[model samples]
Target chain A: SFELPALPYAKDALAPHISAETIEYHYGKHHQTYVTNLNNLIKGTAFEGKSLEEIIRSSEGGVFNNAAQVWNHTFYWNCLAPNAGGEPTGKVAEAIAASFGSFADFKAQFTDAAIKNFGSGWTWLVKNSDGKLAIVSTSNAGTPLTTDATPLLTVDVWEHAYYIDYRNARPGYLEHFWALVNWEFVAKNLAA
Target chain B: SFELPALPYAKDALAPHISAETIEYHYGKHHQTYVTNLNNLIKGTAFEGKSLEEIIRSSEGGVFNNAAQVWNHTFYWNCLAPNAGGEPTGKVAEAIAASFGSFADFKAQFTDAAIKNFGSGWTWLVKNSDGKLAIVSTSNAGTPLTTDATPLLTVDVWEHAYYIDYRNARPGYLEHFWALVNWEFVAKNLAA
Candidate 1:
């Protein structure tokens, strides 16, 4: 059974950037509901005993929707920190420079992609199958977990993610989000 | 040029059920932005002279997204009033009973569909091409305007529609939304 993962930082740690109220609903309610829904949906079904990733890779409809969301929300939480945003260092920096010209370029592109993510979705920094880094955007409860690419980082572009703190200004949310990116977490995900 | 339509009632009218702050963001901001975006997107395009419905039916991508949203938001505001909930009467009541069995059945079905509408979208009570009433759900920016059905009433399920007032409790929003349904407006739309 899935559970709501603990946030890496205190609920209010991301305040000013992301309010605690946002987390209370996004995590305590939204993420928890996904876990609850997945559990209920998979009960007595083939997916009941499958791992989260297995459920994601094999199931469809409600089961897959909740399963992927459970994974993505946890990934999103672990990818952020209280003081984590800013430029990356070492291998992650080198990879971004090589793949996206520079960290600034990567930041701009990622922010643009997140801002334009359309609807309930996520914008990701991923290591592609071709052994290169890329920006990927997935709609709804979609996650990079379903792809061959290794997801390094993601920003929750669903309106609920920022509507409380930023209203409809996704660009505003994208700008502050750079201040919360866990460069170390990203680097770890970067290692093949 | 496109413009934000005035809310049929004051911004604070839908309070208690939907809240004044919601109208500020949903109508004063989000709805206005769509009109602004649609106006800007059509400036140099063939869609410039097209009616909102025409653009919705003929365009794709951002043009369609903004155009349909502009129309949909306006229709949604008109479909709600402070005192407008409960049951339908006269012709619309007769139609709903003939089509969906009973008012309670239609409410249960519509609410269920709205809650499960997946992503950013709407759940609608529509007059289908076959002349029977039906429940329709469309994801993210989709609209009945693009279909052969006549959209009689709609409840916006986009998280932005209820996230502030209901948090992640969509069922709560659904339960309260019945208190704000502009049945008269629904009845007018039901007329040929």
Candidate 2:
């Protein structure tokens, strides 16, 4: 059965940028519920023993939704580090530069996407089929898992992701997200 | 020519049941932003002078999203009352009993729908084309206006609507919403 992964850092590790209480609910409650719901739904089914991404790529309806969200949230947690953010400095850095001209240009486009996403969804930086880095946004429980892209980094624009810390100022949350990004995790995803 | 409407009662009116902080963001920010976006979207365009419901019925994409959200949030505010809840009375009462067997049955079904709605959206009590009251849930700016159903009452299930006060405990938010429902408003919608 799939399980909720432990946060890479303490609940308070991202404090000030993301509060302890926000992690408590976003991770402890919302993330945990997804795992519980997924387990209950897949029990005695073909999907029961499948990997999270496998379930996401091959399933539909409730199975896809919960599996994709479980995968997305785990990736979201890994993309954050206590003192992270600023510019990347590795294979990911070169990819961003080649794809978007410069890091600033990439940040601007990604931030605009996150800010303007109409409802609950996610904005991602992904390596598309052509091996080109691109910004992508998905609504509700949607993910790059459904497409040919390989996700490198993601920021949840779902209100629950930032409501406690940023309230209606989603741009502020996006800004903080940029500051706290774990480029190390993104680099690994890029290499993978 | 449309304007953001004021909250019918004091922001603090729904207190303890729905906190003032919740209203400030839900009404002051979320509701107002929809109006602002709709006005900007329709400016100097054919949709500029259309009624909110007209825009919802005839428009597409951005215009539709903003207009429907405005209409839904307005209806949502009026569906709540201070010290309200228990059960609807009068014509609305008779209608609920006729439609769903009993108020308890209706409550259980509506609560289930609200809790089970997977993402940003609304849960509504609507009068269908057959003139029967039914519960409906729509995702991400979806409204009953797009259908033949006449919206009687709604609870905004958008995470932004309840995340501040209820966090990830949406069922708690639904329980509190039941406690503060404005039956008088439902009766008025029924009469209209």
Candidate 3:
């Protein structure tokens, strides 16, 4: 059975921006529940031992829902850190400068996607089909892993992702998000 | 401009089943934002001076999202009460029996719909086009109004609907929902 990955940092690490109470439930309960559900769903099925990415790319309905959420939440955790989020550097910075004009423009476009994403969704920064940067938003358990594009960074816009701390003020949460992003992981994704 | 409707009960009235803190955000902020956005979106469009139902039936994009949300949330609140919940009487109960065989059967079917409704959405018991009772679930601001069915009763399954009170335990929030259901409102809806 696939397992819930260990969080990269302490539950209280990304505090002030995202509180420990939020993490206690978002990670401890929501993220854990997805892993448990994925395991249960795959038991006695054709999906019994496939990898998460394989399940997500090939499945639909309950299997896809549980598996994608399992992968997405884990990726989301890795995309954040206690003291991160600023302009990029190296090849990641050059890509941003070329694709979005400026880091300021990149933040503005990403924030707009996060705000106007409509419902339970994720806003992503992806290496698009043409191999350049683009912002995309997917509803519910949708992920770029389902497509040909490669996801470099994403912000979970699910209400459960921010309700405990930001309530219905999603833009407020998105504002603080810039302060907690793990750009190094994002850079690593771009390089890999 | 469309106005925010007054909630049927005090914010704390549904306490224990639904906490006041949840209402403060769900009704006070989220629902209020939908109203504000609907107004802003219709400022000078063909939707200007239109009723919420008109806007919802005749629009899409931002206009539809905001208008449908305003109507659905108001309906959801009226379907609940401080101390309600039990088997129905008269036509409503008869409809339930006729459609699902028994009240217990109906509850089970509806609960299944609520639990399995993936992501942010609403679970509803709708009056189908054939004039039979049926359960329906719609994703991301979708409503029965958009179709031939009539919405009878609905539960908001959006994470913000229960995150503060029930955290990731959607089924827990759903269990308490039985205690606060306003059968009178449901009965009236059926009669209409």
Candidate 4:
């Protein structure tokens, strides 16, 4: 039931920062496992009758991870273009400035959050409970679903997301994450 | 007021799987800097007099990483004990069984989660919003605080955590992780 999400570009598109070798293992193996497992888990169960969102919400436990990982990975693939990250302009950057004091300050906090998250998860710039954009982090598969924030953009800090290409150079991955941010998509997510 | 939490054993304690070089960079450089920077950031600021948890909460946009890193690192050191890990047994193990169906299943899931978490975050055995232990991942400096989970044990997947030793083999890092899990500490945390 799980389908491979289309990339905004080729598998090698976010090259140098994110390598095709890494992408192969990540998308081809890891993500596929989640989908396969989810399908196996739901088949013949009452969960099979539900929608993706409902399946996500139905299970008492593991279903959350199965469904969230599905959704998160799908969103993650499209969130980046070949050359995505750049200075946010328009109302998005304006909102960032208004909420975080300045673009420089936001970068400092956001980068620190990504660099320092210490393990597998994501660093996000999302709208907060007060309707202001805030920098946040979520452990694996956790998103801003509970918080008032809508996820605008996220930098996946998971090693599988970058290890082969960067080869333990996380800061290097951070540099590329800054490059492929997909600001327009972020703007759309915000506008929505 | 923060000081380097001494390594539980000698620097070479986790040999073969984890090299001394990895620990030096991970502890001496990365972890220590968070403490140093946190102290500097909070000095004479509104954060100067808050509790650690308070600093983590209200100062997220400002000093969350420093605070969380300090906490994360400290917890990390404690999660490990030399020559440990071989199927937990006790209430903690019972919880693992109840939530994941069996310890073997939990291991497969957790190991898969650890190896699969794309970049710089952690694989965690946590008690979540529903008060059930779950295997989760948190991106850099990100924890389950927002998700109502109590961390039981965690495996750091950051490259700096294993690059010097494990190279690009995250599964090897996890192997060492399983070999060094401090079951007693985890059981205590679960009871608490």
Candidate 5:
């Protein structure tokens, strides 16, 4: 199994909004479990010979869950910070303004994708084949790499992520996530 | 603009998990904007003299967004604590056992509801009309209070919640959220 990620901050750093205890369980147990399980599943199989990205690309059907979970978790951990949420400045801000009317409009569309995903998945702001930011969702451990879009940012809509604290109120969890957007990080993905 | 909600704990108290900078935008701008819009929308309408809850009840469509947004944001702020997130105990635990056969089962059902919800809404563990615990999801601003259920907990699935942190992986977000549930408060609600 891969090593558990070192958290970018402490457990309680995201609280009263997210709470440190939540972070511990989320990262230590859930995310770690995915890594351990995925690694375990891949260890003796032909999939073992391939990198995570390759497994994601070559695999089909159910195999995607294990492979994408590995890659998605890796990205998820890096997308956070103690001080993240703020208005996107510079090119990111300008791009959002140009594409989605304004940050508010971008939020509306992003929120719409999140609120409207058909089932367990995520809403993402990604770059289209034409190099435009777009919104999308993937069920279970599905990832954008499977599609033509290049993912720029993402939101996890799974209940296990927000149910304990937020319960069945995913929107509340979603709204609170604004506290930790890491726009600089998001900008980097867009730049790529 | 409306005033920001005060953080229940010291800004740095949640350190190592989430940062103070995140709170500045979470409570300062995002939540404050909701409150402001809520107030503005209610200023001179029939909603003007109503309580927030009443406004949520009356404004069933677009108007409900601002009204319910205010309530949802306020409730979410107080729903978590620095020391929260452990196994549920007491009455809530009993309720879980009685309703779902075990805490793990209750979690399973809750997670299933969260996973199955189509979009931007909440999945709830609620006291149904028969006073039995059941899981449900509400679209947009829908709430248990408006239906025939007593809400015990919620999970927000909006992109703003974990997009920056979890990316395009809702399952990843869900796994990590186990560490953040407020069992004490949930138990208290059950007792009540």
Candidate 6:
């Protein structure tokens, strides 16, 4: 059975930006539901023993929704650090500049994509097949799994992800996401 | 310019089941943004002066998403009452029985549909072209406007609709919704 993994940091580690309460609900409750759902959905199916990513790559309908959410929430938790944010300082930075002119331009585009996503979804920074970096937004439990793009980082635009801490200030949440992104994790994705 | 409509009842009217705080943010913030976004999107465009229903029926992309949400949320607020719930009477009750065997069966089916709706959207009781009532669930900003069905009532299943009050307990939220449904409003819609 797929298990809900522990957060890399304490629940309060991302507080003020994201509250411990938000984490308790978002991660402790919402994320755990996805894990439980994935387990229940895959039981006695062909997908019973598959990894979360494997389930995402092959499953559709309810199974895909639960599996992708489990994977995405796990990735989302890993994308933050206590004192993170600011521009990257390595090949990832160079790639961002190469693809989008500058980090400023990239940030603006990313923020715009996240802010404009219509409803429950995620905004991702992914490495395309040609190895160029780009922003992609998927609606309602979608992920890069359905496509060839490799996700590097993501900012969950789902209301539950930010509603408690930011209220209806989605743009405000996006601003804080920019300030809290773990560039080190993103860089690791880039390297791999 | 389009304006956000005031809630029909006092903000605190549907307390315990649905908090005033939920209304404050759901209406004051999220719902208002859709109205504002629709206005801004249609400004200087062919959609200007079109009814919200017209916009929902005719528009596509961002315009459709925002306008439909504006209509859906307004309808959602009207579908709750201070001392609502139990079961319908008269024609609405007959219709429910006709469609789904009995009120108990209808409630079970409706609640199941709402619980299983995978992401942000709404669950509706609608009168289809066949003049029969049915349960329908639409993802994201979808509504009955896009189809031949006429919406009699809806339960907003968007996470923001329940996150503050129900957290990850969507089934719990659905239970409260069943107990708080404004049957009077349903009767009015049935008559219309």
- Number of the top DockQ candidate: 3
Question: Which tens-of-lDDT digit does each residue in B1-192 have in candidate 2?
Answer: 679997899999998989999998889998999999999999999887777788899998998998988888989999998988887778988999999999999999999999989888888899998888899999999988888998898888889888878788889999999889998988888887
Error of 4 at B25 (Å): 3.4
- Tens digit of lDDT per residue, candidate 3, span B156-185? 999999988888888998899999889999
In model 3, which runs have C-alpha deviations exceeding 4 angstroms?
none
Better of 3 and 5 by lDDT: 3
Query: For model 1, what is the error of residue A63's alpha carbon versus the real structure, in angstroms, after optimal superposition?
Result: 0.5
Task: Give the per-residue lDDT of model 5 (tens digit) for B1-192.
Answer: 234567677755543333454345456665676788677766777777677777777676556776776676566555556777667877788778998999888877777777655445777778877879988887666677677576777776554455444543566656655666767656665655
Q: Name the best candidate (by lDDT).
A: 3
Docking quality category of candidate 3 according to DockQ thresholds: high
3 versus 4: better DockQ goes to = 3
Cα lDDT listed for each candidate = 0.89, 0.90, 0.91, 0.77, 0.70, 0.89
- lDDT, candidate 1, B1-192, per-residue tens: 986777888878988989999999988889988999889989998888878898899999998888888898888988899877889889999999999899999999999999888988999999998999999898889998888999999989988898889888899999999999988899889885
Listed for every candidate in order, the interface RMSD values in angstroms are 1.0, 0.8, 0.9, 4.9, 9.6, 1.2
Give lDDT tens digits, candidate 4, residues B1-192.
667778888887877666776677778877888889889888888888787777776666438877988888888888877687788887887898899999989999999998867546778888876768888887777776546678888888766787556556678778778887889989878876
Q: Each model's number of backbone clashes?
A: 0, 0, 0, 26, 43, 0
Every candidate's DockQ is 0.80, 0.85, 0.85, 0.21, 0.05, 0.75
Please give, for every candidate in the order listed, the TM-score of chain B alone compared with the true chain B: 0.98, 0.97, 0.98, 0.93, 0.86, 0.97
Model 4 residue runs over 4 Å out of place are A57-60, A87-120, A125-139, A145-151, A159-172, A187-192, B1-13, B37-174, B177-192
Error of 2 at B30 (Å): 1.1
The local lDDT score (0 to 100) that residue A135 gets in candidate 3 is 94
Measured by TM-score, how close is model 3 to the native structure? 0.97
Query: Against the hidden reference, what TM-scores do the models get?
Result: 0.97, 0.98, 0.97, 0.58, 0.51, 0.96
